[PDB]
Enzyme design. Structure first.
Site, mmCIF file in Angstrom:
data_model
loop_
_atom_site.group_PDB
_atom_site.id
_atom_site.type_symbol
_atom_site.label_atom_id
_atom_site.label_comp_id
_atom_site.label_asym_id
_atom_site.label_seq_id
_atom_site.Cartn_x
_atom_site.Cartn_y
_atom_site.Cartn_z
ATOM 1 N N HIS A 1 0.815 -1.225 0.000
ATOM 2 C CA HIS A 1 0.000 0.000 0.000
ATOM 3 C C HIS A 1 0.841 1.264 0.000
ATOM 4 O O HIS A 1 0.430 2.300 -0.530
ATOM 5 C CB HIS A 1 -0.885 0.017 1.234
ATOM 6 C CG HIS A 1 -1.839 -1.135 1.294
ATOM 7 N ND1 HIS A 1 -1.900 -2.012 2.354
ATOM 8 C CD2 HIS A 1 -2.788 -1.538 0.421
ATOM 9 C CE1 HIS A 1 -2.839 -2.912 2.124
ATOM 10 N NE2 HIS A 1 -3.396 -2.641 0.961
ATOM 11 N N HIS B 1 5.212 7.258 6.351
ATOM 12 C CA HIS B 1 5.077 6.615 5.044
ATOM 13 C C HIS B 1 4.727 7.645 3.986
ATOM 14 O O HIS B 1 4.534 8.820 4.290
ATOM 15 C CB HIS B 1 4.010 5.524 5.104
ATOM 16 C CG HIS B 1 2.651 6.068 5.374
ATOM 17 N ND1 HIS B 1 2.135 6.174 6.647
ATOM 18 C CD2 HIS B 1 1.748 6.637 4.545
ATOM 19 C CE1 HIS B 1 0.956 6.762 6.583
ATOM 20 N NE2 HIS B 1 0.704 7.066 5.319
ATOM 21 N N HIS C 1 2.993 8.912 0.012
ATOM 22 C CA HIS C 1 2.007 8.853 -1.053
ATOM 23 C C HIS C 1 2.531 9.610 -2.260
ATOM 24 O O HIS C 1 3.077 10.703 -2.114
ATOM 25 C CB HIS C 1 0.678 9.459 -0.603
ATOM 26 C CG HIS C 1 0.074 8.772 0.589
ATOM 27 N ND1 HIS C 1 -0.848 7.758 0.467
ATOM 28 C CD2 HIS C 1 0.261 8.950 1.920
ATOM 29 C CE1 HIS C 1 -1.200 7.335 1.668
ATOM 30 N NE2 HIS C 1 -0.548 8.043 2.568
ATOM 31 N N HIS D 1 3.467 11.125 5.621
ATOM 32 C CA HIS D 1 2.634 11.133 6.817
ATOM 33 C C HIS D 1 3.390 10.532 7.970
ATOM 34 O O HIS D 1 3.771 9.362 7.927
ATOM 35 C CB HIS D 1 1.363 10.341 6.574
ATOM 36 C CG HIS D 1 0.454 10.980 5.581
ATOM 37 N ND1 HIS D 1 -0.472 10.268 4.849
ATOM 38 C CD2 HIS D 1 0.351 12.269 5.184
ATOM 39 C CE1 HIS D 1 -1.120 11.112 4.058
ATOM 40 N NE2 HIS D 1 -0.635 12.329 4.247
ATOM 41 N N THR E 1 -6.343 8.128 6.001
ATOM 42 C CA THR E 1 -6.639 8.186 4.570
ATOM 43 C C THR E 1 -6.627 6.799 3.951
ATOM 44 O O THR E 1 -6.833 6.650 2.745
ATOM 45 C CB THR E 1 -5.647 9.066 3.792
ATOM 46 O OG1 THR E 1 -4.377 8.413 3.750
ATOM 47 C CG2 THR E 1 -5.500 10.461 4.392
ATOM 48 N N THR E 2 -6.421 5.776 4.785
ATOM 49 C CA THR E 2 -6.470 4.387 4.350
ATOM 50 C C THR E 2 -7.402 3.618 5.279
ATOM 51 O O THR E 2 -7.610 4.024 6.425
ATOM 52 C CB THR E 2 -5.081 3.761 4.413
ATOM 53 O OG1 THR E 2 -4.516 4.024 5.700
ATOM 54 C CG2 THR E 2 -4.209 4.333 3.338
HETATM 55 ZN ZN LIG Z 1 -0.721 8.262 4.590
#
Ligand SMILES: [Zn+2]
Ligand SMILES: [Cl-]
Ligand SMILES: [Zn+2]
Lengths: 217, 217
Positions: A58, A83, A85, A102, A169-170
């Site tokens: 992810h 992590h 994006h 993030h 957001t996940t």
């Molecule tokens: Zn994130």
């Protein structure tokens, strides 16, 4: 399991994770119109090390050792991981960035707070990212960092932020999450961001409505 | 159906109304600690009449005719009804009031905004409440007001407010609701509040946690 596109993509997260579809206090958002407010400075005390990268299919997630702590609102939130994006999830003033980090923190009781840092293009390779991304693990794998790295050095120098109340957001898209989006982007070369994007693909969730919230700065 | 106490009381609203139990952006709250912010004045343009009271077994609700409009955030929210809670649901600075009015507005698309007015004890009967409450209907019934009344006259003179993002305080406890709690209480005599309370009983929902929200003033 869940993904960004396709049968298990963002449009269907609600099948297994109700808040992703039903919540009306979700992240990400376009930080465009804001309200001027008297906000306390964040206390970000990062004194440890990034140990490894994990690719869970992810994102690319960095794990930590040592004491790396966000203190805000009288609560102590320990950095659990950070992590990435590609492209960014939140926008600043209608602009989407090539890369967003993030930094995800939790109180010992489990309450979550995210510090977001945008990375824009610059001419020079970011030295801390060079160290961090020297080897990016493939899906379902982990890699120990070859070299020492303190996560403090990935934060922008200026610590002014936008604040809003939102969500993960996940999946499970949990709400009650404090968001602190740094106003100053960090830098990553285009080549560095492309290196990450080619591993992660497009793992940005679409923008969500602000609804009854105001964004503070 | 639902109630405040007992099998279908506030502790069990989640049985049929999931957001009441799962939401983490709920109303009511204790408006104690606040953040100073640059907030626009509300535009409250109430030019119509209160026509009737309805007792739906949960509250005493006043319905309207004419043009009674809240404009805020670039959206036009028409007053749909106002109703009462005894004791108050929200607190101000740790204080619960004897009576709270909720003026519930909706945009034509259905988006909700509540203006809350606390009523504290005073020596004199409130003239507008005397008019409004001259006949309070029993459960499952409606009564047409005997006399003319403009809802404007029930708002406090001073229009400074606290703002937060919250929910309906009754099933379905929907979120995404703007709350504007007037800083200045109105007045109701103790006898007037007792008259309402003896019909409604205790219809105040317990306080909810602020979670990741800040209250603005
Ligand atoms: Zn994130
Ligand atoms: Cl909020
Ligand atoms: Zn109410």
């Amino acid at each position: 399991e869940w993904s960004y596109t396709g049968e298990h993509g963002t449009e269907h997260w609600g099948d297994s994770f109700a808040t992703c579809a039903e919540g009306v206090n979700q992240t990400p958002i376009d930080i465009n119109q804001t309200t001027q407010a008297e906000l306390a400075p964040l206390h970000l005390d990062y004194e440890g090390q990034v140990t490894e990268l994990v690719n869970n299919g992810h994102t690319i997630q960095a794990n930590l050792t040592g004491k790396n702590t966000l203190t805000v609102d009288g609560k102590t939130f320990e950095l659990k991981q950070f992590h990435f994006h590609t492209p960014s999830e939140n926008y600043l003033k209608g602009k989407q960035y090539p890369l967003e980090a993030h930094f995800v923190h939790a109180t010992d009781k489990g309450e979550l707070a995210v510090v977001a840092v945008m990375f824009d293009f610059g001419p020079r390779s970011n030295n801390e990212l060079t160290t961090l991304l020297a080897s990016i693990p493939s899906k379902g794998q982990t890699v120990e960092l070859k070299e020492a790295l303190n996560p403090a050095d990935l934060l922008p120098r200026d610590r002014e932020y936008y604040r809003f109340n939102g969500s993960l957001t996940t999946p499970p898209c949990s709400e009650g999450v404090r968001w602190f989006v740094m106003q100053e982007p960090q830098t990553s070369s285009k080549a560095q961001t492309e290196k990450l994007q080619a591993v992660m693909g497009n793992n940005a969730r679409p923008l969500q409505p602000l609804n009854a919230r105001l964004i503070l700065e």
